[model samples]
Target: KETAAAKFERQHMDSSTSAASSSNYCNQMMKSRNLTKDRCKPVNTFVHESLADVQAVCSQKNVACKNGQTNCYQSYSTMSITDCRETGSSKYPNCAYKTTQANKHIIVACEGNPYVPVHFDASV
Candidate 1:
C-alpha cells in the first residue's frame, strides 16, 4: 500500500519535471500517476517546488476545505504549479486534459503524526 507521504508525492509533487507546456501534460500525467483509476480525477494540481518547501505549507495560513474541514492550509508564498483539468470531451480511459501552469498560493490538506500535505485542495 502507498504511504500518505507517497500518496501526496504522487498526486501533488513534480519537482523533477519541467513546466508543462502542452495541454496533454495532465492527461498523460494523471493517468501515469494512476490518479485516473476507478474514474478520472476531474481536477488536480501538481507543485513544481521542492518536497521540503511544499511540506512547509502545513505551518502556513490555515484554510477550511470545501467540505468544511479545517485541516487545509494555504502556501505563504507563490509556488510553481500545474493545474490539470479534464476536458469536457474527456471520457474514461481516453481522458483528455487542459494543462495550465502558474505561480500561485496553493491550498492543501495536511495530516498525520509529523504533519505533512495529504491532499491537493486548490491553488489561489
Candidate 2:
C-alpha cells in the first residue's frame, strides 16, 4: 500500500530533472508519473527541490491549509517549480497539460511520525 507521503512524492517531487522548460513536459510527466492512470488530474505542481528541503517545511511556521487544516506550512524561500494544468482538450486516457515554471514559496500539508508533506496546498 502506498502512503500519503509516498504518493505526494510521486505526484510532486522532481528533484533531479530541470526539464520543465520543455513544451511536452507536463504531457509526458503527468503520464509517466502515473497521475493519468484513471481520470486526468486537473491541476498539479512539481517541486524541483530535494526531498530533504521540502520535508524541512514541515518544521517551518504553521499555516492554515486550503481545507482549513492547521498542519500546513509555507516554505520560507521561493523554490523552483513547474505547474501542470490540464488543457481544455484534455481527456482521460489522453490527458493533456500545459506547463508553467516559476519560483515561489510553497505551502504543503504535513503529517505522520516523521512529518512530511502529504498534500500540496498552494504556492505564492
Candidate 3:
C-alpha cells in the first residue's frame, strides 16, 4: 500500500507536474519589480494563484495588477513601473523575502497543486 507520504513524494518529483502548483503564501509581499524603496506601496495586493508550469506562472505575475477584492485599483503604472526601471537599490531598498505577513495584506500566491490560503490581519 502506498503511504500518503510516499504518494506525495512520487507526485512531487514529476517534471510534468510541478512540486509547487497550488499553495498560497501567507504574509507574502507581492512586490513590484518596478519600485526599489517603495516595495510595500503596492496599494492593491493580488492573491494570485499559480498554474502548474513555471512559464504559466510568470505570465500573469508582473504585467498589471489590481485588488481582487474591494476593487481598489493598482497596476504597473507609468510612474511606479517605469521611472525607477534603472535606479540604484540604495534609493529603493529591496524588501527581503520572508515567509510572514507583510505591511498591508498577507498577499498570497499558491505553492502546490490545489493551493490553500489564510491571512493574518494585524490591523484588526
Candidate 4:
C-alpha cells in the first residue's frame, strides 16, 4: 500500500522524468532544437510510465519507503540478478529508484530539490 506522501513523491519524480518539468534534461533537449524551456518539455523515464509503475518496483523490492526514500543502484549483468536502492545520504525525502531488464531498456528515477538529479544510461 502506498501512502499519500509516497504517491506524491512518486508523482513528483514522474513529473521530473517526464515532460512535465523544466529540469536540465528538458533544457538540453530544448537547447538542441533552439527551443525554449516551454517549447521542449521533459519526458517520462523510457522504460516506465507513471509513478504508479514506480511504486510497484518498490513494493516488489520490499524497500521500507516510509522513513523517507532511497537512491537506486541497479545492475543488469548475466549470472548476477541484483537490485539496489541506496540509502543513508543527505538526499532523502527524495529517491533514486530503478528497474532492470534484459537487453531492452533501463528505467531509473531519481529526484532532489532545486536540481532534478539527472543521470542514466540505456542498453538495447
Structural similarity to truth (TM-score) of each candidate: 0.90, 0.96, 0.18, 0.23
Across residues 1-124, which tens digit of lDDT does each residue of candidate 3 receive? Answer: 8553333223221233212132222112223223224443323222221223311322222322233332121222111011011222222344333222222222222223433222211110
Best by lDDT: 2
Supply every candidate's count of residue pairs whose N, Cα or C atoms clash at under 3 angstroms: 0, 0, 12, 6
lDDT of 1 by residue, 2-86 (tens): 9987899998898886587677788888988998898988988888999999999999999999889999999989999999988
> In model 3, which range of ten residues has the least summed lDDT?
76-85
| Segments of candidate 4 deviating more than 4 angstroms | 1-50, 59-70, 73-105, 109-124
Q: Model 1 TM-score?
A: 0.90
Name the weakest run of 10 consecutive residues (lDDT summed) in model 2: 16-25
Residue-level lDDT for 4 in candidate 2: 98
lDDT, candidate 4, 9-103, per-residue tens: 43233323323222233233323333232322222222223444433433222221233445432324211111222233313223222322222
Question: Considering lDDT, which of the candidate structures 1 and 3 is the better prediction for this target?
Answer: 1
Candidate 2 local distance difference test against the native: 0.92
Q: Tens-digit lDDT track for model 2 on 43-79?
A: 9999999999999999997999988879999999999
If the candidates were sorted by their lDDT against the true structure, best first, what order would they fall in? Answer: 2, 1, 4, 3
Pairs in steric clash, model 4 = 18-42, 18-43, 18-44, 19-42, 19-43, 72-96
> Which model scores highest in TM-score?
2
| Deviation of model 2 at 4, angstroms | 0.8
